[PDB]
Amino acid sequence: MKPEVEQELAHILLTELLAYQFASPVRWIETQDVFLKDFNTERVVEIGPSPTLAGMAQRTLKNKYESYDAALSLHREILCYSKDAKEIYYTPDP
Amino acid sequence: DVIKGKDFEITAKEVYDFTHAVGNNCEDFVSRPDRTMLAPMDFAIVVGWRAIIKAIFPNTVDGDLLKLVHLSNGYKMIPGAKPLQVGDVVSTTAVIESVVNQPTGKIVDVVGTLSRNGKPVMEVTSSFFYRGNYTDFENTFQKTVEPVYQMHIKTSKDIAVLRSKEWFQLDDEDFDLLNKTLTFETETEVTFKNANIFSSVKCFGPIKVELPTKETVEIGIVDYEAGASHGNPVVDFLKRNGSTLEQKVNLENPIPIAVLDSYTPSTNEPYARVSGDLNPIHVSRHFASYANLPGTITHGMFSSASVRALIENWAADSVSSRVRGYTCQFVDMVLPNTALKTSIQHVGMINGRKLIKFETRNEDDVVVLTGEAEIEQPVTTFVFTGQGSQEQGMGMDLYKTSKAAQDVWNRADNHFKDTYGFSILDIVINNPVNLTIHFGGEKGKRIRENYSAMIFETIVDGKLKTEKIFKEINEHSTSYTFRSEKGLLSATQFTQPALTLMEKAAFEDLKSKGLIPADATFAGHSLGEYAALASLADVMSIESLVEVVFYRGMTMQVAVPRDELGRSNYGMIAINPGRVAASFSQEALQYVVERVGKRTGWLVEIVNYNVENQQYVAAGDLRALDTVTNVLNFIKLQKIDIIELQKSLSLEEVEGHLFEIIDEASKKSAVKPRPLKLERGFACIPLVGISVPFHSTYLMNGVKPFKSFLKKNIIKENVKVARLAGKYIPNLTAKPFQVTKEYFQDVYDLTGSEPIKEIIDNWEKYEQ
């Protein structure tokens, strides 16, 4: 696959993903699984005005990753931009 | 000439002996079951030493090797390259980067590339000093490989300046440089006459242009070649007018990480055995006395490795692979049995990597060992919030302070003013109840055309009808007024772009601060997907991003029929299956909702899967949401499981036995009037302020005009595949985006689109 064709494929795929995105259910469970298990995410940084998806990740980790996290022995930080801006910007107090 | 070292095969024994000798207790270097043992990056100098040191030997680099000072040592991992493991056969080369005669003596810089399976893994830079008076300027040189410089050629002035430079030699003289990104991969070879002037300069190497596919192609060469000079103008010209692909951005204030205490070992025998640096001055009192040193000094490379083990413990959180770069200047000799204090700081970022500066002092508070590290932040994923809290003045604190948040909001606001004749910044700040757009002038006609161009498709009695959004704006209209109850910021068409701009601006702030890892994964919940893609992939300009989400909000707004007061017969409920019964699983709830949908014949679907057996969002017909709510409120009170009953009790009885519960709930639900308020049930909370069942097959009709709007605002030239492939996780598929036939098939299976079905059927024609 040439780069120029790959690009026009990605373009087509992406526009179809976005177009239909609001017509089809949001599979955030299967999305959480992917970044938490299939990538072993250590930081989940939420961007938004409230910590909802940070809330949801904490509730996912506590419910079916307690054993998986102990077995691999990895820390998972769950940060939000609004509440934990100091832990993301590295702007601590004296 | 290049110096070739011998193939080192890393063994488990060698790593143990190395770690114990330098006191590096990191778990990555201990043998565990079911994981390969890594070697430290300090272990590179073990592999490379026989090549690197061989550089200071040749007759033409003549020096008293008893009076040899090791000035600096640096390791730089190559980007992408995973660290050294046990079993890896490593080949080393080394080259003399420079050999210059300072006044005080001769400085020899040596670069020592370690390579496995052909591909290079890391560089080992080393500065040696020979003390003395050296005037052999015939043997001095300085073959550098320069950092890749970039120029965005924006104006015609920039083109005329480049063309002025005789060294800028394009293959095609008539190449169009305008709005191109040139990269300069240059090597600078300098010979000397005296200490101050070069006798011969020679910068050369390719000039590459970025194609619309991000794939750089050679379009020219640098070919500078001077005699007696006082400098190299090419690199000076590129420094002033260019950029290095990566900018160090400092923090406001250095953060102290720790102040850690290390001890040099009583004897330097162990580090000498493992490293292979059998320099007598570390071991033999007589040779140390002959070299005028205060005693058998500790190997500098030991102190390096000892402090890099602290850095790796305290800044890399005991993960070896995170340390991508480590330099140390050796400042003063350390004797054995010396207690050293290391004050490690976090000084800045560099494209998502921490810049640690350290400084090691002895008991006399004398600086002995300064140096920088670069540390990969932990494997990150950015999730972008969807629709939720639309608090007035949101993102406005950041807008007041940040220059990159300002640029996002001012680009967006200017484009909304010029395109749809309102200021989103106004609507965010002061949340008016009404907003009148006016279509007077030449501007007002263009703005009126942009409202009249906005269409939506829906079903009118089993027929696809392409009605217009803003049916009352026609060629004669002078104004249009957006109504609301409490404020317009609450309305979907202004909520969406405001939230998307808050999320973009927060991100572009971070990215300006250097806090975004290059390889970071990302996803966004619903709307959060557009904010995410503009943020991490740069697939849309701000201007396109804000149009698309505006049009999305308007397509949502009108997607349903509404009454006179603007309330529909659709809604959304938040269902916690855990709270109705601990045994009530997901595929239980899914089974109740499909049943309720088919039986009563009204729309109801699960639209958010948010937290397994704890958070689901069901949208659909505002009556079918009541039937579900009564069914779950019923099942809690009889304490009767459907997963247990359908398996161990009976077969296809749950079907008929649940249908009499649906009919019980449905005949009570249909009695009350059509604008029925949803009651906060036991296991059902109504999503306030939502009257459109989006993420259901109901909006499947309204896709085509939304698609055609996207394909205007998303250009194939913008869509970089690197930045998306295996990083972006869609809401549709829930699988890291890949440009593979299996992925396309997975998309077609959810949403039978003909532009995907043609790609499937014609896959091999695209492959070649």
Total domains present in chain B: 6
CATH classification at residue B139: 2.40.128.700
DSSP code at position B699: G
Residue contact B528–A39, C-beta within 8 A: no
Is B526 a known active-site residue? yes
- Determine the Cα–Cα distance for residues B356 and B608; give it in Å rounded to an integer: 42
One-letter identity of residue B176: D
Q: B132 with B225: CB under 8 angstroms?
A: no
Is residue B127 left, alpha or beta, with left meaning phi > 0 and alpha meaning psi from -120 to 50? beta
Distances (CA, A) of B204 to B97, B169, B227, B448: 16, 10, 15, 56
User: Two tokens at B442?
Assistant: 């030449």
Residue B403 burial (10 A CB sphere; 0-12, 13-18, 19+): exposed
Q: B422 with B437: CB under 8 angstroms?
A: yes
Residue contact B613–A63, C-beta within 8 A: yes
> Mapping DSSP to helix (H, G, I), strand (E, B) and coil, where does residue B345 land?
strand
φ and ψ of B319, to 5 deg: -125, 115
- Determine the Cα–Cα distance for residues B416 and B394; give it in Å rounded to an integer: 18
Closest CA–CA distance from residue A15 to any residue of chain B (Å): 7
Residues in B 469-528 with any Cβ partner in A closer than 8 A: 499, 502-503, 506-507, 510, 513, 515, 521, 523, 525-526, 528
DSSP code at position B721: S
User: Two tokens at B40?
Assistant: 């430290």
Q: B150 with B242: CB under 8 angstroms?
A: yes
> By CA distance, what is A55's nearest residue in B?
B611
Q: Chain A partners of B734 at a C-beta cutoff of 8 Å?
A: 27-31, 33-34
Best of A2, A24, A33 to disrupt the B interface by mutation (most B CBs within 10 Å)? A24
Q: B346 with B358: CB under 8 angstroms?
A: no
Residue contact B732–A7, C-beta within 8 A: no
Distances (CA, A) of B637 to B632, B633, B668: 9, 7, 18
**Domain span at residue B395?**
378-432+488-561+690-730
- Determine the Cα–Cα distance for residues B275 and B18; give it in Å rounded to an integer: 7
Verify that B276 and B332 share a domain, yes or no: yes
What percentage of chain A's residues is helix, strand, coil (to nearest 5)? 55, 10, 30
Is residue B538 left, alpha or beta, with left meaning phi > 0 and alpha meaning psi from -120 to 50? left
- Determine the Cα–Cα distance for residues B338 and B664; give it in Å rounded to an integer: 84
Pairing of strands B380-384, B353-361: unpaired
Distances (CA, A) of B240 to B150, B152, B156, B168, B243: 11, 13, 18, 16, 8
- Determine the Cα–Cα distance for residues B742 and B169; give it in Å rounded to an integer: 46
Distinct helix (H) and strand (E) counts, chain B: 22, 32
Q: Chain A partners of B379 at a C-beta cutoff of 8 Å?
A: 39-43
- Determine the Cα–Cα distance for residues B550 and B494; give it in Å rounded to an integer: 7
In order, the DSSP letters of B421-467 are S--HHHHHHH--S-EEEE--HHHHHHHHHHHHT-B--EESSS-EE-P
Say which residues have a Cβ less than 8 Å from residue B244's Cβ, sequence separation at least 6: B147, B148, B149, B150
Residue contact B612–A17, C-beta within 8 A: no
Give me the torsion for CA of B242, B247, B249, B255, rounded to 10°: -150
CATH classification at residue B766: 6.10.140.1400
Verify that B80 and B186 share a domain, yes or no: no
Q: Within a 13 Å sphere around the CA of B172, how many CA atoms are in the beta-carbon half?
A: 8
Residue B168 burial (10 A CB sphere; 0-12, 13-18, 19+): buried
Pairing of strands A26-27, B604-611: parallel
Give me the torsion for CA of B359, B363, B365, B370, rounded to 10°: -20
SS3 track for B183-250: EECCEECCEECCCCCEEEECEEEEEEECCCCCCCEEEEEEECCECCECCCHHHHHHHHHCECCCCCEE
CATH classification at residue A25: 3.90.25.70
Say which residues have a Cβ less than 8 Å from residue B314's Cβ, sequence separation at least 6: B257, B258, B260, B344
Verify that B197 and B123 share a domain, yes or no: no
Distances (CA, A) of B560 to B32, B690, B696: 60, 12, 12
Residue B667 burial (10 A CB sphere; 0-12, 13-18, 19+): exposed
Q: Between A28-36 and A52-64, two packed helices, what is the crossing angle to 10 degrees?
A: 70
Verify that B28 and B160 share a domain, yes or no: no
Closest listed residue to residue B382, CA positions, set A47, A69, A56, A4: A47
Closest CA–CA distance from residue B384 to any residue of chain A (Å): 5
Place of tokens 């019980």: B664
Helix (H) or strand (E) holding B69: strand B68-77
DSSP code at position B65: G
Verify that B402 and B500 share a domain, yes or no: yes
Q: B729 with B736: CB under 8 angstroms?
A: yes
> By CA distance, what is A16's nearest residue in B?
B707
Verify that B278 and B156 share a domain, yes or no: no
Q: B514 with B351: CB under 8 angstroms?
A: yes
Q: B394 with B362: CB under 8 angstroms?
A: no
φ and ψ of B634, to 5 deg: -75, -55
Distances (CA, A) of B301 to B110, B154, B595: 15, 48, 72
Helix (H) or strand (E) holding B359: strand B353-361
Q: B559 with B567: CB under 8 angstroms?
A: no
CATH classification at residue B611: 3.30.70.3330
Rg of chain B taking only CA atoms, in angstroms: 34
Say which residues have a Cβ less than 8 Å from residue B259's Cβ, sequence separation at least 6: B341, B342, B343, B344
Distances (CA, A) of B180 to B158, B175, B431: 11, 10, 42
Q: Chain A partners of B525 at a C-beta cutoff of 8 Å?
A: 26, 28, 52-53
DSSP code at position B332: S
Closest listed residue to residue B654, CA positions, set B662, B663, B645: B645
> Mapping DSSP to helix (H, G, I), strand (E, B) and coil, where does residue A8 land?
helix
Rg of chain A taking only CA atoms, in angstroms: 17
Task: Give CA angle at B591 (B752, A34), nearest 5°.
Answer: 60
Q: B498 with B489: CB under 8 angstroms?
A: yes
- Determine the Cα–Cα distance for residues A44 and B524; give it in Å rounded to an integer: 12
- Determine the Cα–Cα distance for residues B592 and B595; give it in Å rounded to an integer: 5
Q: Within a 13 Å sphere around the CA of B23, how many CA atoms are in the beta-carbon half?
A: 12
Closest CA–CA distance from residue A87 to any residue of chain B (Å): 11
Q: B696 with B607: CB under 8 angstroms?
A: yes
- Determine the Cα–Cα distance for residues B427 and B419; give it in Å rounded to an integer: 16
Q: B320 with B41: CB under 8 angstroms?
A: yes
Closest listed residue to residue B694, CA positions, set B526, B456, B528: B526
Q: B309 with B360: CB under 8 angstroms?
A: no
Residues in B 409-428 with any Cβ partner in A closer than 8 A: none
Residue contact A49–B388, C-beta within 8 A: yes
Q: B668 with B629: CB under 8 angstroms?
A: no
Q: Chain A partners of B767 at a C-beta cutoff of 8 Å?
A: 1
C-beta neighbour count of B84 within 10 angstroms:
24
Distances (CA, A) of A28 to A82, B573, B617: 21, 17, 11
> By CA distance, what is A43's nearest residue in B?
B380
Q: B739 with B725: CB under 8 angstroms?
A: yes
Say which residues have a Cβ less than 8 Å from residue B251's Cβ, sequence separation at least 6: A90, A91, B346, B347, B348, B349
- Residue A88 is nearest to which of B395, B515, B694, comparing CB atoms? B515
Task: Give CA angle at B88 (B87, B91), nearest 5°.
Answer: 140
Verify that B95 and B25 share a domain, yes or no: yes
Verify that B184 and B217 share a domain, yes or no: yes
User: Long-range contacts for B760-766 (Cβ within 8 Å, ≥24 apart)?
Assistant: B766/A1, B766/A5, B766/A9
Verify that B124 and B199 share a domain, yes or no: no
Residue contact B521–A8, C-beta within 8 A: no
Say which residues have a Cβ less than 8 Å from residue B630's Cβ, sequence separation at least 6: B664, B665, B668, B669, B681
Say which residues have a Cβ less than 8 Å from residue A33's Cβ, sequence separation at least 6: B734
Verify that B641 and B698 share a domain, yes or no: no
Place of tokens 């379009």: B219
SS3 track for B119-145: EEEEEEEEEEEEECCCCCCCCCEECEE
Residue contact B737–A89, C-beta within 8 A: no
Total domains present in chain A: 1
Paired strand residues for B574? B617, B685
- Determine the Cα–Cα distance for residues B157 and B375; give it in Å rounded to an integer: 40
Say which residues have a Cβ less than 8 Å from residue B750's Cβ, sequence separation at least 6: A20, A24, B732, B733
The one catalytic residue in B343, B484, B526, B541 is: B526
- Residue B710 is nearest to which of A18, A25, A63, comparing CB atoms? A18
Residue contact B383–A47, C-beta within 8 A: yes
- Determine the Cα–Cα distance for residues B594 and B450; give it in Å rounded to an integer: 41
Paired strand residues for B341? B261, B361
Helix (H) or strand (E) holding B343: strand B339-349
Closest CA–CA distance from residue A70 to any residue of chain B (Å): 15
One-letter identity of residue B198: F
Q: B390 with B498: CB under 8 angstroms?
A: yes
- Determine the Cα–Cα distance for residues B753 and B467; give it in Å rounded to an integer: 22
Residue contact A22–B502, C-beta within 8 A: no
User: Two tokens at B723?
Assistant: 């930045």
Experimental method: cryo-EM
- Residue B251 is nearest to which of A22, A33, A90, comparing CB atoms? A90
Task: Give CA angle at B173 (B167, B174), nearest 5°.
Answer: 140
**Domain span at residue A4?**
1-93
Verify that B81 and B10 share a domain, yes or no: yes
Residue contact A48–B385, C-beta within 8 A: yes
Helix (H) or strand (E) holding B328: strand B323-330
Residue contact B506–A24, C-beta within 8 A: no
**Dihedral over Cα of B546, B552, B554, B556: its sign:** negative
Q: B124 with B48: CB under 8 angstroms?
A: yes
Q: Chain A partners of B615 at a C-beta cutoff of 8 Å?
A: 56, 59
Q: Chain B partners of A48 at a C-beta cutoff of 8 Å?
A: 384-385, 388, 499, 502-503, 528
SS3 track for B141-156: EECEECCCEEEEECCC
Q: Chain A partners of B605 at a C-beta cutoff of 8 Å?
A: 25
Verify that B414 and B534 share a domain, yes or no: yes
Q: B153 with B177: CB under 8 angstroms?
A: yes
Place of tokens 């005789």: B166
One-letter identity of residue B452: S
In order, the DSSP letters of B664-677 are HHHHHHTTS-SSPP
Is residue B310 left, alpha or beta, with left meaning phi > 0 and alpha meaning psi from -120 to 50? alpha
